[PDB]
Structures are given as C-alpha cells and as structure tokens.
Amino acid sequence: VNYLSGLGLSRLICLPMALRAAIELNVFEIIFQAGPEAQLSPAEIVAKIPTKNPNAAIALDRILRMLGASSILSVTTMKDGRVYGLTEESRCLVADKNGVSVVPMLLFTSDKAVVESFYNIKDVVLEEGVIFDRTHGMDFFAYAGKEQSVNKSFNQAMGAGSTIAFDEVFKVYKGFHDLKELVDVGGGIGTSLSNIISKYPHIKGINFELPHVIADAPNYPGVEHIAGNMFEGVPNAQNILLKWVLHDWDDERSIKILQNCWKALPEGGTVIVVEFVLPQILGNNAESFNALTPDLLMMTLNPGGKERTTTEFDGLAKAAGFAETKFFPISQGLHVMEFHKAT
Amino acid sequence: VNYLSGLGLSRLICLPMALRAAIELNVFEIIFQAGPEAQLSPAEIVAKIPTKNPNAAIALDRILRMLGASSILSVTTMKDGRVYGLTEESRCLVADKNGVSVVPMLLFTSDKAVVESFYNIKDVVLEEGVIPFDRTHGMDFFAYAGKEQSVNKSFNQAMGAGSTIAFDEVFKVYKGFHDLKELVDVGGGIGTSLSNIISKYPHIKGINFELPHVIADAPNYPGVEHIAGNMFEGVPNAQNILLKWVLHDWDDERSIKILQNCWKALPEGGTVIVVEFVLPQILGNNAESFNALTPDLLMMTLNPGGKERTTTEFDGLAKAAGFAETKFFPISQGLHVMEFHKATA
Numbered sequence: 203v204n205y206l207s208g209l210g211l212s213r214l215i216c217l218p219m220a221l222r223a224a225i226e227l228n229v230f231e232i233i234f235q236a237g238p239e240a241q242l243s244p245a246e247i248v249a250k251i252p253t254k255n256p257n258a259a260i261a262l263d264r265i266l267r268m269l270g271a272s273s274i275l276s277v278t279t280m281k282d283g284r285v286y287g288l289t290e291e292s293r294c295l296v297a298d299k300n301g302v303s304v305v306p307m308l309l310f311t312s313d314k315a316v317v318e319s320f321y322n323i324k325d326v327v328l329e330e331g332v333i334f335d336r337t338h339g340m341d342f343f344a345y346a347g348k349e350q351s352v353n354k355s356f357n358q359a360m361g362a363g364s365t366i367a368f369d370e371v372f373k374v375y376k377g378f379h380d381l382k383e384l385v386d387v388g389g390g391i392g393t394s395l396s397n398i399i400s401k402y403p404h405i406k407g408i409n410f411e412l413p414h415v416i417a418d419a420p421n422y423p424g425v426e427h428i429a430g431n432m433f434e435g436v437p438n439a440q441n442i443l444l445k446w447v448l449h450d451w452d453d454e455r456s457i458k459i460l461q462n463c464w465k466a467l468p469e470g471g472t473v474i475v476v477e478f479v480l481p482q483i484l485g486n487n488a489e490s491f492n493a494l495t496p497d498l499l500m501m502t503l504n505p506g507g508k509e510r511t512t513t514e515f516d517g518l519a520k521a522a523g524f525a526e527t528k529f530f531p532i533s534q535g536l537h538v539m540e541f542h543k544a545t
Numbered sequence: 546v547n548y549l550s551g552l553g554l555s556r557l558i559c560l561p562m563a564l565r566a567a568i569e570l571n572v573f574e575i576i577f578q579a580g581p582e583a584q585l586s587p588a589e590i591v592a593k594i595p596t597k598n599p600n601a602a603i604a605l606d607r608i609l610r611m612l613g614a615s616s617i618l619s620v621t622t623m624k625d626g627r628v629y630g631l632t633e634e635s636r637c638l639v640a641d642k643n644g645v646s647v648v649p650m651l652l653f654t655s656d657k658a659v660v661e662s663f664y665n666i667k668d669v670v671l672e673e674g675v676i677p678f679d680r681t682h683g684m685d686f687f688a689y690a691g692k693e694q695s696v697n698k699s700f701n702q703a704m705g706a707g708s709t710i711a712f713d714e715v716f717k718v719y720k721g722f723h724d725l726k727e728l729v730d731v732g733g734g735i736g737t738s739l740s741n742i743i744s745k746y747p748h749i750k751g752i753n754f755e756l757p758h759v760i761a762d763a764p765n766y767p768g769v770e771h772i773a774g775n776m777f778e779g780v781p782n783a784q785n786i787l788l789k790w791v792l793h794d795w796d797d798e799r800s801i802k803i804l805q806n807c808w809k810a811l812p813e814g815g816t817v818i819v820v821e822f823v824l825p826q827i828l829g830n831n832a833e834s835f836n837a838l839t840p841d842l843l844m845m846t847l848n849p850g851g852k853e854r855t856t857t858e859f860d861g862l863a864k865a866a867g868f869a870e871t872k873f874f875p876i877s878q879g880l881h882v883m884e885f886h887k888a889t890a
C-alpha cells in the first residue's frame with residue numbers, strides 16, 4: 203500500500219556504495235584520530251583528506267548523511283550543520299593496535315569483479331549446473347592467478363579476517379596447546395599460521411597453497427610456504443588446519459579435500475576446521491548474518507560452495523574417514539571443529 | 546571492538562543483489578498469488594518459476610533466507626524447512642490493479658550502469674567539478690540514455706512507475722489541478738504524469754515536453770501531445786507548467802535557467818507546479834529522510850550537480866527566477882507539491 207516510500211528501497215544499493223566511498227576516503231580513521239568520542243563536521247574531516255576541492259565538504263556530507271541515517275555513523279544536527287561520530291557498528295572500521303580492521307574484507311566483497319558476478323545469481327536458480335565462471339570465463343581461483351589486483355585484494359581480505367578470527371579463537375579454544383606441527387591447507391598468505399605461531403612458538407607451521415598465493419606471501423618465522431594442489435594431495439602432517447576452505451566447495455569436493463587430509467595424517471592426527479556454522483533457525487541476528495553473508499558470496503563466486511550446519515560438518519568428517527568429531531563454539535557462529543583420525 | 550561480526554558488514558552489498566535476483570525471479574508476485582498471508586516454501590515458489598533445474602529450490606532458499614533475515618520477507622522455520630511470506634516492507638513489490646509497482650524503479654537504480662558509476666562517487670569529494678557517470682561513461686546520463694536503448698527504456702519505465710505512485714498520493718491531498726485547462730510538463734518523461742492528471746481532470750489539455758529519444762519511447766496518451774525540444778533553450782508557451790523530478794537533477798545555476806525559461810513561457814498568473822521530495826532539516830532513520838537521501842545519492846552518481854533540496858532552497862530558486870509567490874503543499878513522507886506563481890497585475 204505504501205508504494206511511495208517503497209521507492210526508498212533503492213537505499214539498499216546506495217548504502218553499501220556510500221560505505222565503500224567513506225572507507226576509501228578514510229573517514230572512520232579520521233574521526234577516530236580526532237579524539238575518543240569526537241564528532242566531526244564534514245569540513246573537519248575534509249581537512250585530513252588530500253584534496254583541494256572547495257566543494258569537498260558539501261559532497262562528503264551527502265555520503266555521511268546516508269551513513270548516519272543508516273546508523274553506521276552517529277549524526278547530530280547542530281545549527282552550523284551536522285557532525286559525525288563513530289558508532290558501535292563502525293568501530294570495526296578502525297584499525298587495532300596491529301593495524302588490522304575489517305576494511306580489506308569489506309573492499310573485497312564490494313569489489314567490481316564480485317558485484318559484477320552478483321547480477322547472475324538468479325542463474326543458479328534458473329539453470330542447472332551453470333556457474334563467475336559465466337560472468338568471467340574461468341573459476342575464481344584461476345581468475346585470481348590471472349588478475350593480480352584481485353589476487354591481492356582477496357588475499358588481504360582473508361588475511362585480515364584471519365587475524366580477526368584467531369583473536370577470537372584464542373580466547374576460548376586451547377586445542378593448539380600440545381601441537382608441534384601444523385599444515386595449513388589453503389592457508390592463504392600465511393597470516394593464520396603466523397597468528398598461531400606467535401601464540402604458540404613451539405609450533406612448526408607449513409602453509410600449503412596455490413603458487414600465485416604463495417608468490418605473494420610474506421615470510422613469517424616458523425612458517426614455510428609450499429605450493430600445491432590440495433585435490434591431488436596434501437603434505438604429510440601431524441595435524442592440519444582447514445579455515446574457510448570447506449565452505450568454498452560442494453560436498454563431493456569437500457569430501458575429497460578431507461580424504462586427502464586423512465591420507466596425510468598419522469594415526470591420531472587431527473584436522474582443525476575453522477568455519478562459521480549455519481544456525482538451524484535463521485533470523486535478524488549476528489550469528490545468522492555471519493553465515494548468510496559468506497553463503498551468498500559463495501553463491502556468486504563459487505556456488506558449489508555453501509555454509510553448513512554442525513550436522514553437515516559431522517557428515518563430511520564421517521564420509522571422509524574421520525571417526526570422532528568435536529565442536530567448539532567460539533563466538534557468534536564461528537566454530538573450531540576437530541576431526542580426529544582414530545588411534 | 547567486535548571485529549568478528551563487523552565482517553558481516555559485507556551483507557550490505559549482498560542484500561540489494563539478493564533483492565534484485567528475487568525481483569527478476571518474480572518471487573513476490575508468486576507469494577502474493579497464493580494469498581494475502583501466504584507463506585510458501587522455496588519448492589512451492591519454484592513451481593511458478595520457468596525452470597527445469599531440480600536444484601532451483603535449494604538455490605532460491607539461499608537468496609530468500611538473506612531477504613528474510615533482513616526483514617524484506619518473513620522467514621519461518623518449520624519441520625519441513627523454511628517458508629517465506631510478504632512483509633509490510635515488501636508489499637510495494639506486488640503490482641496494483643493497473644500493474645504498477647516499485648519494481649521498475651528498483652531495477653533501474655541497481656542497474657549495471659548505475660552501480661558501475663557508484664564506484665566513483667568518492668571522486669566528487671576529491672576532484673572539483675567531476676562526473677561519476679560522465680567519468681564512468683564519457684557523456685552525461687541523458688545523452689547516454691539516447692545512445693543505449695536498454696537504459697533509455699529502464700529509466701523511462703522507472704520514472705513512469707514512480708509517476709503513477711507519486712500522483713496516487715498527490716491526489717489525496719492536493720486540489721490545485723482542479724481549475725486548470727492546460728498543463729505543459731517540462732521534462733515529463735514518457736507522459737505518464739500528464740496521463741494520471743488528465744484521467745482525474747479530463748478538461749486538462751496536456752503537452753509533454755521532452756527530449757527526442759524519450760518521446761520515441763513514449764506511448765500515446767489521450768489528451769497528451771508530445772513535443773520534442775531542449776528546455777534549456779526554451780519552453781513552449783504554457784498557461785501552467787509541471788516540473789516533477791526535474792529540478793533535483795540540476796545544480797542551482799541550471800535549475801534557475803530552467804525556471805527562468807518557464808517564467809518566460811507563462812502569462813501573468815500562470816503557475817509552475819513543482820513535485821519533488823523535500824530534504825528535511827533534521828535527518829534520521831525514517832522514511833521522510835530516506836525518501837530524500839536515496840535520490841540524493843543517486844543524483845550524486847548520475848549527474849552530481851543534481852541534489853535534493855530543503856523548502857528554503859526551493860523558495861530561493863523560485864525567487865531568483867522571477868516568481869515572487871511560493872506555496873508549499875506537503876503530500877506524504879517528504880513528497881511535496883510546490884506552486885511558483887507568476888504575478889498578476
């Protein structure tokens with residue numbers, strides 16, 4: 203009945219593009235640097251933006267306006283204009299003391315190559331077996347090996363997410379305690395292993411990745427980088443880490459990965475899986491969005507991939523030869539899961 | 546700081562693309578066709594989708610559950626699986642008795658050409674005098690519509706649906722069209738606005754004044770004569786003029802030029818009738834603010850000179866263009882009708 207304000211549903215595409223602009227203009231760091239609970243005018247923010255455009259503050263106010271009404275920024279309207287401060291939702295856009303924030307992930311997820319592929323997600327409903335591989339011509343990981351800007355943006359997105367995930371993991375999960383050697387299958391640029399190793403310096407880390415990812419991985423002490431193809435085989439390992447890998451693949455390919463892991467482990471070895479877990483009852487909450495967001499990104503980037511429930515992860519482990527599963531909830535849907543090879 | 550769930554801010558880009566998919570798959574009409582409070586499973590929705598893909602329901606569920614978590618649809622988990630129903634926010638996606646919905650507008654504003662230009666709105670901050678669309682595409686938006694027929698059609702249908710929606714609300718409140726005999730719609734789109742007015746007031750003779758490529762796309766409406774031209778060079782002589790969602794496309798200088806040409810085309814006592822959303826002075830998380838901020842951001846990307854305006858700014862434009870009398874008619878949730886009156890003796 204309210205068609206008039208239903209036209210405002212166009213805000214759903216405006217908001218993420220306004221946010222990307224504000225991130226690229228470094229708005230949130232400028233606000234945070236001004237003081238603990240600073241509220242800055244657009245002109246005060248523009249003072250820290252490298253531009254000599256006199257109309258920059260008027261233009262910036264149009265972007266921050268939308269973010270404030272959307273609760274990404276606080277907006278207080280005063281007589282000379284609006285002033286903007288951080289909110290609980292935008293704190294994560296400011297780097298921590300090690301220089302890590304969600305920004306690399308947010309820029310990747312809204313990058314051109316991803317948003318372009320989003321126009322074809324209805325084809326996964328309409329066309330059996332069709333797959334990015336439409337929109338672009340190869341699979342996402344091959345495309346990354348070919349487009350270095352995408353490789354870098356994705357690798358940095360996953361590295362930032364890795365620091366963020368393991369900072370949460372280490373408050374709850376102590377299973378890395380007794381380990382001596384850990385092979386990270388698809389471990390990205392090695393950030394996960396570096397985080398683990400810095401916490402447990404006795405761990406020998408081996409990062410197992412595609413050549414075009416390894417080529418741009420920095421050298422962390424205690425980490426050796428090995429190139430390979432996890433579908434053909436995984437290096438012999440006392441224990442294996444599998445973080446944000448299984449959710450890239452359908453059941454058949456996930457079982458193949460896990461079976462290769464099983465073959466590389468000795469009796470008693472463990473695969474440590476780190477994923478978000480799809481809740482049984484979905485709703486408007488952090489645990490739901492934390493799984494539904496990567497699930498939709500998978501549908502456009504590697505639709506074989508999908509997020510899974512605890513029951514589905516146990517089913518993958520048992521189908522791959524693992525006898526015992528153990529589930530360790532971390533935070534808001536993030537889980538560590540242990541797949542134990544029998545002793 | 547909850548960095549972990551802050552990664553979920555990626556949902557902001559997923560949500561409009563999920564909604565666009567659901568629109569293109571006709572999900573909302575399918576649910577409505579089952580009943581007012583119908584709640585359908587993905588398998589039942591897929592039954593009305595032309596596909597032979599046995600995995601369609603599982604795939605559709607991945608899109609729907611995101612819309613349900615974001616309150617665009619209801620998502621209820623039953624023993625057999627999830628079912629989905631319409632909400633107050635998604636009723637506007639179902640066409641009315643005449644086949645009119647917000648869908649044409651929603652498909653245009655998430656169109657590839659619009660979204661691609663969105664990547665350069667930061668350039669309006671950084672560079673004096675820059676073009677998000679004119680940079681992204683090499684010419685201004687209206688010329689680009691002249692060149693790409695699919696964009697011409699998507700935009701014209703978006704504006705046409707928005708016109709019916711807007712005037713359905715206008716006619717509940719505004720009586721100023723009652724005694725008019727002639728109305729020239731400057732930049733009137735494909736003429737839907739005049740058709741809505743004339744059908745409620747059959748004595749009004751309408752003149753739709755538009756660019757050639759818009760006229761070529763327009764149907765024949767009774768009582769509406771189409772005239773091609775360029776409003777910046779001049780406007781046809783008119784007893785009264787309609788200006789709906791035109792001024793917000795242009796900066797103050799060009800808005801004044803349009804209004805001055807309107808003044809020159811009017812006799813004494815003639816009126817410009819302006820229909821726009823009005824930017825409120827104090828903004829918040831509400832319809833009236835989003836109803837202005839949303840087209841404002843679209844204008845920032847499509848023709849950055851364009852901007853949404855306060856009542857004080859509209860009055861200033863009218864006065865700078867030779868209209869000394871202004872009247873403001875709030876319609877609903879920020880939409881206003883405004884009358885700029887040319888003086889009589």
Ligand SMILES: Nc1ncnc2c1ncn2[C@@H]1O[C@H](CSCC[C@H](N)C(=O)O)[C@@H](O)[C@H]1O
Nearest residue numbers: 360364388389390411412415431432445446
């Ligand atoms: N066939 C293959 N063999 C080894 N790694 C592969 C692979 N196919 C894809 N990958 C890698 O799997 C990774 C999944 S993204 C996850 C990266 C990292 N584990 C993290 O949690 O941040 C990508 O880095 C990709 O390069």
Ligand SMILES: Nc1ncnc2c1ncn2[C@@H]1O[C@H](CSCC[C@H](N)C(=O)O)[C@@H](O)[C@H]1O
Nearest residue numbers: 704708732733734755756759775776789790
């Ligand atoms: N120089 C010009 N002369 C005449 N019309 C123009 C113009 N430049 C842009 N326009 C038209 O102005 C319109 C603005 S969109 C608004 C259309 C219509 N009044 C409605 O409310 O739905 C477009 O249709 C565009 O074709």
